[PDB]
Design a protein around this ligand. Structure first.
Ligand code: CLA
Ligand code: CLA
Ligand code: CLA
Ligand code: CLA
Ligand code: CLA
Ligand code: CLA
Ligand code: CLA
Ligand SMILES: CC1=C(/C=C/C(C)=C/C=C/C(C)=C/C=C/C=C(C)/C=C/C=C(C)/C=C/C2=C(C)CCCC2(C)C)C(C)(C)CCC1
Ligand SMILES: CC1=C(/C=C/C(C)=C/C=C\C(C)=C\C=C\C=C(C)/C=C/C=C(C)/C=C/C2=C(C)CCCC2(C)C)C(C)(C)CCC1
Ligand SMILES: CCCCCCCCCCCCO[C@H]1O[C@H](CO)[C@@H](O[C@H]2O[C@H](CO)[C@@H](O)[C@H](O)[C@H]2O)[C@H](O)[C@H]1O
Ligand SMILES: CC1=C(C/C=C(\C)CCC[C@H](C)CCC[C@@H](C)CCCC(C)C)C(=O)c2ccccc2C1=O
Ligand code: SF4
Ligand code: SF4
Lengths: 49, 730, 161, 138, 81
């Protein structure tokens, strides 16, 4: 019951690292095999590249 | 035992069920023993308590091998004569691409055999006779067919000296266990009287018969076959009948000469072997020493002498034994023999000693990796057999209280250090590379380690290499260039298709491989050192030497109590060394082709098999499969339907055999039992099994069939990977 | 005179071992370390803390100001306290939750001395928790702090050469 | 440790033998008879000469005394003692106690052997799942 | 259990049979005859480590013996130290 429980904190965020960012309102507009997004990477190690 | 002892049977025993350890093979049947006995056919716990013979057996086994090489290589030298390639190549060298060996055409076979040649279909060869060979001057196929039977002569005879020991009524103790001479002789006149003798047949005959070959002809347009004695007009060219010197010495005048010699330094142009003429002098200047040297001496004398305060009392009578351990006087040897083989592997590629090598790329790197796996396969051994000492060999204690008894005194100590050494390395010796990935994949080169990025700045240049060629400030006199052409100072100019040999300048990205070697050489040795040291008794077991250097593992308790022993330290130490060498190989060819192996072109613009891709791109350890494994190897996986093909066609098997080892390496034992019965059941129903109790593998046999396969797997994989990226472009 | 002391392995009994030798025990080494915790406890710690904090302090500069992530800095900060001052914090408490291995808890109070101690049996603990605090409390003001007369200093500096 | 040397048994130094938690737990010294002075193998990589006695060297852990013992009866004698020391003296007194030389009778001590049932058919599984009513705790 | 690996057999005779094992086993208890009549699986076992040197020799004629206590000492470990 500590199960089901952790499956929804997964699912919630699955739907919540979507819809401030990473399209729908471009992917529905009509979605051609380019690269629709889950989430935003943020690592300090990154270069500009 | 008693079929029937002593005095009263000539009559041999074949039969009644046969032998070892006293509840001898049972009578009643088993499998394991058939695996025992090939293994541990000689150990020498058993056969006799008393050394007695065995030294009287090991001289005979030695004879067998010497013959055998001989059987070998008559074969080779055959093959080499009468499937010639050779006559054809030699007028022709630097065109030819040479075979001794041909299939017959049955079934598939013959894809294999693809035009090599002075016009014949072949399998191309990369061990060079044809280069040992250049030396014979006289030539022609039927002789080598004499040198060949001259081989089978030495054999039969250097193989009836092995009848002429053990089996024949044969020898006793003093003869080895009075040593007193033995190196006296050996090094003096064979070590000496060969190199000496070799001199005499290394200017007499060879020098002249390639002094005017290094032009062309069709041989014998040059050389008569005996031609070369009382005679000699011909020496006259290549120098004087000493004209008036006397037995060297001096009241001698040269206004223009000094005897053949005249030192070379650098490489021949139009045969870039290095001069065929320092080759007499050097061998001559050897032998003398040996000639003088093998004249010590009789012993403890020198060993019993110098002592120090840290230094060891033991040093003295550092071994009455030594004369009769054996297992120890083999272990010492292997370290040297072994460590004295892979010192070949360098002086070879950075100083060829045979005509046409370097230009011949593939026919001297095969070498530098074959000679390389022996200067390693013989070293881990050189530990095993010390472990075999450290446990057993002497009846009793009386070695006592020395130098050894010393080293052991510390032992959780010599190996206490060495350990940290390795984790210091590894962290400075591999994660070093991993930086690059994690940060060049992050991508910010500013801060990598690239030869350009983290600052040393663009010179390698001065350490030794630059002092080494640059050589004559010196008490040094000699010879226009180097001892080794590669060293930094000097020269464009070496060879006729192709580049043979050039500076190699390193920087960084020679810096850190050179360091992974350290850490790889070091953690190898940790396990063998701690292995052979903790041989007999340990903090985990005291009752530890009691059967074995082998025993499987003492038992589930103490936590683990499994690996321990020292068969197994010489089981997990092979496991490393397979890398030690396997990555040193990976080093040389990626260099030697990324830089050096070459071509010359008009105005000498060098064109390395790869324009130095190494540069910024070995440093990344993916570049090691971007630039290596995935780059080269494209010739292995393209190799089908060809001639070499047997490599691509191996490269799958043996790249299979390896990935079969893990099954033997990674698994239980009463498992394949538990299985072997389900089997044994089905077997009995039809009435088809019991007799010779079928049994699973002997804990440590299972490890024996790991390892051994993991190596002949993981190894020939590259033996294929290689011969497939030097044959054909490169 | 005696070939090396009146020739003994250890203090005396062979059996613990340690093969006491130079670099274990030479009048010359041994001495370069007793105000400091190796043998005796100089003072109740509190002070050793900062000579420890501080010395180890202005270290960890050129390590992460000359080998820093994008190195040779043009910033006011480094040369620098920066991140390193951050390390003495991680370090210094990684240090404390080890002073939960010993608590053993008291004030007795003696940095003042009675009678040549012997500690008696100092070997082993007899450091209460209320000791290991005043050390890893000296550590913070030794770490952070010892990080500034590192950068405070202009580096007058010596060039590779 | 000079002011008292009790010693009987004769190494010189080693890296080997006991390090700190012999003081903080349980101690383990072994003692013996001897004739005329002989040179010996050890536990811990090697070796020494004996003479006489107490002949009372101390070891790390019990496996080590017994381990000589095998060691000690090839090359012989009857007499070997091994005692266990604390810090703080006694309880657990190790070789002293009745007889020695296991392979004799005076008494039982010990051991049983069976638990509740004998070797035969535990094809039968474990049973009731641990409750403090039924004899599953020995 | 805290050391429970059954080596028992039926003869529990111990001549040219089995002795090997660091301390653990005093046996020679007798039980009211078995031929040789020294019996039992054990003496008190809270002393030493976990061998199976325990058979290796002299029958157990069902299970071998082995690791299994689980519940594990340090002295029973080898290492604490
Ligand atoms: C100059 C030394 C040389 C000599 C004379 C010896 C002699 C000896 N070694 Mg030894 N050894 C050596 C080098 C040498 N070793 C080296 C270099 C190593 C490191 C690998 C070892 C590692 C080693 C171990 C671990 C052992 C010995 C043992 C022994 C003793 C047992 C010999 C035996 O039964 O053959 C054994 C040979 C076989 C059973 C033949 C099987 C060979 C297989 C693995 C094939 C190899 C792969 C190859 C590619 C297959 C052929 C091709 C195929 C695919 C068609 C004997 C006294 C053993 C001992 O117990 O001491 C008393 C112990 O096993 N040696
Ligand atoms: C023609 C004769 C012959 C005969 C009938 C015998 C008979 C005997 N020899 Mg013997 N021996 C011979 C020639 C012979 N020997 C020679 C020429 C040598 C020196 C090269 C020896 C060196 C020798 C030794 C050291 C010993 C014996 C022993 C023995 C006895 C045991 C033989 C045995 O079962 O080994 C079976 C093995 C073979 C039959 C083959 C021998 C191996 C060598 C010579 C060739 C095989 C290598 C070959 C290339 C295989 C590897 C490649 C493979 C992949 C195909 C037996 C009475 C032993 C003894 O006294 O009893 C304890 C003792 O150990 N021999
Ligand atoms: C029985 C098993 C099953 C099978 C069929 C395989 C098969 C294979 N595994 Mg594999 N594997 C398995 C289970 C299996 N695995 C399991 C359970 C694991 C653990 C998870 C693995 C882990 C594993 C790894 C890590 C690897 C493999 C690899 C391989 C392949 C090697 C390439 C090859 O054989 O080319 C086929 C072509 C040939 C064999 C041509 C043969 C021609 C030659 C040999 C001559 C003819 C034969 C002749 C008798 C040989 C001369 C000997 C003579 C002296 C008698 C092969 C397909 C390796 C690979 O290549 O990529 C993954 C890799 O190393 N496996
Ligand atoms: C060094 C090794 C050794 C090896 C691995 C080989 C291997 C080979 N020899 Mg060979 N040979 C050898 C020693 C060896 N020989 C010696 C010492 C002699 C002198 C007696 C010969 C005389 C010889 C002849 C005359 C022939 C071979 C042939 C061959 C090939 C035929 C295969 C075969 O023998 O069975 C099947 C094969 C490549 C055959 C060949 O070259 O035709 C393809 C040819 O029949 N050999
Ligand atoms: C050990 C060596 C080897 C052997 C077997 C020979 C053997 C021979 N050499 Mg000789 N030689 C050698 C190395 C050898 N040489 C080397 C290294 C050099 C140069 C450093 C020479 C330079 C040389 C010369 C200049 C001559 C010989 C001659 C001879 C022949 C008779 C004189 C003699 O040297 O000994 C026998 C001793 C006496 C006759 C006295 C004889 C066949 C001579 C010849 O042709 O025949 C007379 C003479 O031409 N050698
Ligand atoms: C443990 C023993 C005893 C002692 C106390 C020493 C001590 C020393 N030996 Mg020594 N030695 C000994 C036995 C001993 N040795 C024995 C038995 C041998 C023969 C195996 C040697 C062979 C030997 C050599 C070849 C050397 C020494 C050197 C040295 C000195 C090192 C240099 C130094 O510190 O000044 C340097 C300080 C500066 C401030 C500069 C040092 C005084 C070295 C020496 O001569 O001094 C440099 C030299 O390397 N020893
Ligand atoms: C260029 C660089 C940067 C700068 C400005 C400094 C500056 C300093 N380092 Mg330093 N250091 C650096 C990088 C840097 N380091 C790096 C990358 C490391 C790697 C570990 C070190 C390791 C290090 C150590 C171990 C020490 C210093 C010390 C010092 C200081 C004493 C100066 C001296 O030589 O004593 C002057 C001495 C007298 C006047 C007497 C000085 C403030 C200390 C020191 O140098 O004291 C000797 C201490 O030794 N550094
Ligand atoms: C008495 C007399 C005499 C004697 C004679 C003789 C008998 C001699 C000899 C000579 C000799 C006796 C020589 C020898 C030589 C040797 C050598 C030269 C060696 C070799 C080898 C090899 C070649 C090998 C190689 C290798 C290696 C490297 C390792 C392993 C592999 C192989 C094997 C490849 C005289 C003359 C005075 C005369 C008078 C009489
Ligand atoms: C059906 C069947 C079968 C099967 C077959 C198969 C399937 C196979 C395979 C195989 C594989 C799949 C693999 C294998 C491999 C092998 C090998 C491989 C061998 C060998 C080797 C060698 C000879 C080597 C050499 C070397 C050296 C010198 C050292 C190192 C390097 C090298 C390795 C090169 C048969 C017919 C049999 C039988 C009947 C049934
Ligand atoms: C690969 C990256 C370059 C970095 C190293 C460059 C520094 C040295 C200059 C080039 C090195 C190659 O060395 C090469 O120089 C010339 C190419 O221009 C060639 O020059 C050669 O050809 C001509 C024929 O008479 C003449 O110009 C020269 O007398 C002769 O030596 C040579 O084949 C070789 O000696
Ligand atoms: C697979 C595997 C086995 C099972 C492997 C076995 C049983 C190999 C033995 C098979 C033999 C070689 C077959 C021999 C039968 C033929 C030689 C008989 C007929 C003769 C011919 C003419 C075919 C172990 O026994 C084992 C033991 C320890 C650790 C790991 C493992 C392990 O991984
Ligand atoms: S090992 Fe088995 S058979 Fe032997 S005495 Fe013990 S119980 Fe009896
Ligand atoms: S190894 Fe097993 S049988 Fe031997 S003493 Fe230890 S627990 Fe007992």
């Amino acid at each position: 019951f500590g199960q089901l429980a952790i499956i929804f904190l997964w699912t919630s965020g699955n739907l919540f690292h979507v819809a401030w960012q990473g399209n729908f309102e471009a992917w529905v507009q009509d979605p051609f095999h380019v690269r629709p997004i889950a989430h935003a990477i943020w690592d300090p190690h990154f270069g500009q590249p | 035992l008693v079929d029937r002892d002593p005095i009263k049977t000539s009559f041999e025993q074949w039969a009644k069920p046969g032998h070892f350890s006293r509840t001898i093979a049972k009578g009643p049947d088993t499998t394991t023993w058939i695996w025992n006995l090939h293994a541990d056919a000689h150990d020498f716990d058993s056969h006799t308590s008393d050394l007695e013979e065995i030294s009287r057996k090991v001289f005979s086994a030695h004879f067998g091998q010497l013959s055998i090489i001989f059987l070998w290589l008559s074969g080779m030298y055959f093959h080499g004569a009468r499937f010639s390639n050779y006559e054809a190549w030699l007028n022709d060298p630097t065109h030819i691409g040479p075979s001794a060996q041909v299939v017959w055409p049955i079934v598939g076979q013959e894809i294999l055999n693809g035009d090599v040649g002075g016009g014949f279909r072949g399998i191309q060869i990369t061990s060079g006779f044809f280069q040992i060979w250049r030396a014979s001057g006289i030539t022609s196929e039927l002789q080598l067919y004499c040198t060949a039977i001259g081989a089978l002569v030495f054999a039969g005879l250097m193989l009836f000296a092995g009848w002429f020991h053990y089996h024949k009524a044969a020898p006793k103790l003093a003869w080895f266990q009075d040593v007193e001479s033995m190196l006296n002789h050996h090094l003096a006149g064979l070590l000496g009287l060969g190199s000496l003798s070799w001199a005499r047949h290394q200017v007499h005959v060879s020098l002249p018969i390639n002094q005017f070959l290094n032009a062309g002809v069709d041989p014998k347009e040059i050389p008569l076959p005996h031609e070369f004695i009382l005679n000699r007009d011909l020496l006259a060219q290549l120098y004087p009948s000493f004209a008036e010197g006397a037995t060297p010495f001096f009241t001698l005048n040269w206004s223009k000469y000094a005897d053949f010699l005249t030192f070379r330094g650098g490489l021949d142009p139009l045969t870039g072997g290095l001069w065929l003429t320092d080759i007499a002098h050097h061998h001559l200047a050897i032998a003398i020493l040996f000639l003088i040297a093998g004249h010590m001496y009789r012993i403890k004398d020198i060993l019993e002498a110098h002592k120090g305060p840290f230094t060891g009392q033991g040093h003295k009578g550092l071994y009455e034994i030594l004369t009769t351990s054996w297992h120890a006087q083999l272990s010492i040897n292997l370290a040297m023999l072994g460590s004295l083989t892979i010192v070949v592997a360098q002086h070879m590629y950075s100083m060829p000693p045979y005509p046409y090598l370097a230009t011949d790329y593939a026919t001297q790197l095969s070498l530098f990796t074959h000679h390389m796996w022996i200067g390693g396969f013989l070293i881990v051994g050189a530990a095993a057999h010390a472990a075999i000492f450290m446990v057993r060999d002497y009846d009793p204690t009386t070695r006592y209280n020395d130098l050894l008894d010393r080293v052991l005194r510390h032992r959780d100590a010599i190996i206490s250090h060495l350990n940290w050494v390795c984790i210091f390395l590894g962290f400075h010796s591999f994660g070093l590379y991993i930086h690059n990935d994690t940060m060049s994949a992050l991508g910010r080169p500013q801060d990598m380690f690239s030869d350009t990025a983290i600052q040393l700045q663009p010179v390698f240049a001065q350490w030794i290499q630059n002092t080494h060629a640059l050589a004559p400030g010196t008490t040094a006199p000699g010879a226009t260039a180097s001892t080794s052409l590669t060293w930094g100072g000097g020269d464009l100019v070496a060879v006729g298709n192709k580049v043979a040999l050039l500076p190699i300048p390193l920087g960084t990205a020679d810096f850190l491989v050179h360091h992974i070697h350290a850490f790889t050489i070091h953690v190898t040795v940790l396990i063998l050192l701690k292995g052979v040291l903790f041989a007999r008794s340990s903090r985990l077991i005291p009752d530890k030497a009691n059967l074995g250097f082998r025993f499987p593992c003492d038992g589930p308790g103490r936590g683990g109590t499994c690996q321990v022993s020292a068969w197994d330290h010489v089981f997990l130490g092979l496991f490393w060394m397979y890398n030690s060498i396997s990555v040193v190989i990976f080093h040389f060819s990626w260099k030697m082709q990324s830089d050096v192996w070459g071509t010359i072109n008009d105005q000498g613009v060098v064109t390395h098999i790869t324009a130095g891709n190494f540069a910024q791109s070995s440093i990344t350890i993916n570049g090691w499969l971007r630039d290596f494994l995935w780059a080269q190897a494209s010739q292995v996986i393209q190799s089908y339907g060809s001639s070499l093909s047997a490599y691509g066609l191996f490269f799958l098997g043996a790249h299979f055999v390896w990935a079969f080892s893990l099954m033997f390496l990674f698994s239980g034992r009463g498992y394949w039992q538990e299985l072997i019965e389900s089997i044994v059941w089905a077997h009995n129903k039809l009435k088809v099994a019991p007799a010779t109790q079928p049994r699973a593998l002997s804990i440590v046999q299972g490890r024996a069939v790991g390892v051994t396969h993991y190596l002949l797997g993981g190894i020939a994989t590259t033996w294929a990977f290689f011969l497939a990226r030097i044959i054909a472009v490169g | 005179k005696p070939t090396y002391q009146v020739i003994q392995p250890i203090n005396g009994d062979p059996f613990i071992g340690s093969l006491e030798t130079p670099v274990t025990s030479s009048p010359l080494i041994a001495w370069y370390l007793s105000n400091l915790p190796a043998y005796r406890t100089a003072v109740s710690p509190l002070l050793r803390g900062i000579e420890v904090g501080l010395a180890h302090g202005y270290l960890l500069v050129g390590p992460f100001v000359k080998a820093g992530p994008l190195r040779n800095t043009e910033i006011a900060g480094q040369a620098g306290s920066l991140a390193a001052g951050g390390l003495v914090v991680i370090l210094s408490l990684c240090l404390t939750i080890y002073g939960i291995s010993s608590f053993n808890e008291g004030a007795p109070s003696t940095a003042p001395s009675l009678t040549l101690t012997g500690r008696k049996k100092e070997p082993d603990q007899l450091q209460t928790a209320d000791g290991w605090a005043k050390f890893t409390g000296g550590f913070f003001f030794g770490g952070i702090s010892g990080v500034i007369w590192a950068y405070f200093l202009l580096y007058v500096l010596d060039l590779p050469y | 440790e000079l002011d008292p040397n009790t010693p009987s048994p004769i190494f010189g130094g080693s890296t080997g033998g006991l390090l700190r938690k012999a003081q903080v737990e349980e101690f383990y010294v072994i003692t013996w008879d001897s004739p005329k002075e002989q040179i010996f193998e050890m536990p811990t990589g090697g070796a020494a000469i004996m003479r006489e006695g107490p002949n009372l060297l101390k070891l790390a852990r019990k496996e080590q005394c017994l381990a000589l013992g095998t060691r000690l009866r090839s090359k012989y004698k009857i007499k070997y003692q091994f005692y266990r020391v604390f810090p703080n003296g006694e309880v657990q007194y190790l070789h002293p106690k009745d007889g020695v030389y296991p392979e004799k009778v005076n008494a039982g001590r010990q051991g049983v052997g069976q638990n509740f049932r004998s070797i035969g058919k535990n094809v039968s599984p474990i049973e009731v799942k641990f409750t403090g009513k039924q004899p599953y705790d020995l | 259990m805290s050391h429970s690996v059954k080596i028992y057999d039926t003869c529990i005779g111990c001549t040219q049979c089995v002795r090997a094992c660091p301390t653990d086993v005093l046996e020679m208890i007798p039980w009211g005859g078995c031929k040789a009549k020294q019996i039992a699986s054990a003496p008190r076992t809270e002393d030493c480590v976990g061998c199976k040197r325990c058979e290796s020799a002299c029958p157990t004629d069902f299970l071998s013996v082995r690791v299994y206590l689980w519940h594990e000492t340090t002295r029973s470990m080898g290492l604490a130290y």
